Amino acid sequence: LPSPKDLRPFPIRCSTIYAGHKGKVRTLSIDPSGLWLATGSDDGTVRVWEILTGREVYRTTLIDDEENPDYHIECIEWNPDANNGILAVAVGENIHLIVPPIFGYDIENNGKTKIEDGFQVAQWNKPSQKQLEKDICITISCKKTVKKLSWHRKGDYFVTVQPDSGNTSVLIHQVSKHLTQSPFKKSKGIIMDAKFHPFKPQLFVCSQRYVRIYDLSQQILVKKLLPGARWLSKIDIHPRGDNLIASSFDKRVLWHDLDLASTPYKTLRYHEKAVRSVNFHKKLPLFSSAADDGTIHVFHATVYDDMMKNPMIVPLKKLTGHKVINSLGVLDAIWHPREAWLFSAGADNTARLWTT
Template identity: 40%
Template sequence: MCCCRQDLLPDLPRPRDLRPFPTREALQFLGHKSVVRALAVHPLGKILATGSDDHTVKIWEISSGRCIRTLDVGDAVTCLQWNPNSRVLVLAVCVGSCVVMINPESYLTEAAVVTRTNALFMVPPEQGDYEVNKKVQRAVTWATPSSDERQMGYRVVLKHLCPVQQIVWHPQGDYFATLQREAKSSSVIIHQLSRHRSQIPFSKSAIKVTAMSFHPKKAYFYICCQGRVRVYSLLQKKLIRLIRTSSSSEWISSIAVHPSGEHFIIGSHGKRLTWYEMEATNRPYTLRYHHGAVRSVAYHNKYPLMASAADDGRVIVAHAMVYNDWIKDPLIVPVKELRSHAFLDGVCVLQLCWHPCNPVLFTAGADGTVRLWQ
């Protein structure tokens, strides 16, 4: 009895049997005049925020594609994220060396949520005998916005030493982390919104951080640097895992942690995606879907879906099923290639994110457009 090579390959399901997943462009959000680098959907799924090099943040009604508010923030927007706590309406925006907490006060949100958000920032929290560490004081300052800024929706401003490239929220919505790559030993700062306090937990590690993420369930924090991913315990304040990528010079552009917390994926400028299981980080899955630097990766919070965007102009949607049986490998099947954004100076799709409730994907492009795929 003989067997050919095809007999040894696993039988993968057909993409049509793995629906639902986005297959077509359904809507464009038009209005930005320059590159769109940032976008985020509010946890309730009704409104979308986008940030651009044209110095504006726009708030959109997702169902209609209508822009309901435009804020001129005075500089290019590098990142923005909604607070994951749906009981408040807080948008964190990275503008130059500042992070601005904004309450857009949208009519699409319940009045009680808007009121609760304003009450959160009404009076700065009492600090008592708390003294700010001198190193922290040099790296970041909590500031009260001016009256004109408050009219725009600003509620608090965090002034950093260097330009801020990324912000990530802890799933509970009180803690968040900011990344300023040029600040070396103080590149990653973790802040507490309710108490207006900051700390630099990784100051001894003078490494060039390129991306970061909180663990969705445990007090773990992921830091990506050149050729390595470091996993820290925030409770024990120590490194618990050091993961080396296949190339020590690989520039990791993005990281996404699976909602289960047992898997994560990184995208790199080396045109590859690498999927890791936390219990077997020495046996990663390398996915070579793209022909350009990978800019953004994301898991869906509810559906077994994953997406990646790269400089080849393509967005790849993959079925990404993980199992409770740790012996069973994840099922990763590319199901759709999405392509519509135009190129500008060699780059195309810069950011993507999933709708929190539906199998709907949003992409932001160098062509100044934002697109909804369903």
């Protein structure tokens, strides 16, 4: 197998600290243009940052009582479609769609008109005056806490996870119609993650124990993965669509080759503590795991689409720098869409940029 030296580029150092949050950074997202990092924190704010300088350029306070242990900013993600300025934010039992005033008319109006056009498991509400001042354009109110949100590639649909909400633990929302639907009749376990396939009409649903793949067109289950863990935390799907990685609180990362077998192709043990995030690069043959030990591990993976060879996975680099706070370390991470750059969110109140 090739040495890391033969597998550059990959990140090896922290060049930039995004400093300002006054509480744990639970979630972060990079915008479609690859220039703007958004972060969500227990200090009750969402912030947007100029990625190469670390300069904070925007802040909105979504929770005025940030000391409240009952609800927090849980998950944020920029809409993936270019030039609409939309940021989705799950906080408590609500999803806000926010368009920050940092892009100008052509982009901001595109987002706002998209969200306004659409004008019972979930309710879609016009913002109050207080919410307008926070740059909220619409709010989707669910019955239970929303822990995870993920956009479909085309930027109209998004899926959310409400753990222990039974039949409505997984909801699919459609911005253009202000429509929320529960795709499933049956609740199978506590749901940890839900993600659309990169190009197939499929939804991947991660429970604590399994990953189930549904064909939304055929309306049927097509595969059930058996990772062999009791406490799955997150999944990501390889950009060419035939492989998956899964993190677990029991310190493992599982690679599943979806066509090869339902059990893990490879089990990676590179963390001393619970693994909170796994993330594929969208273009480069890289992925990462991030854990409560405060470390990020970076891997190479070559996938052989056509020929009878299984994936080649090579560890590249251990990234250290985040501080462990109350047994928590790196809470989230996301790759730049094009560069070998990784962004991480820390329990230590920082986000960080890791570069070559």
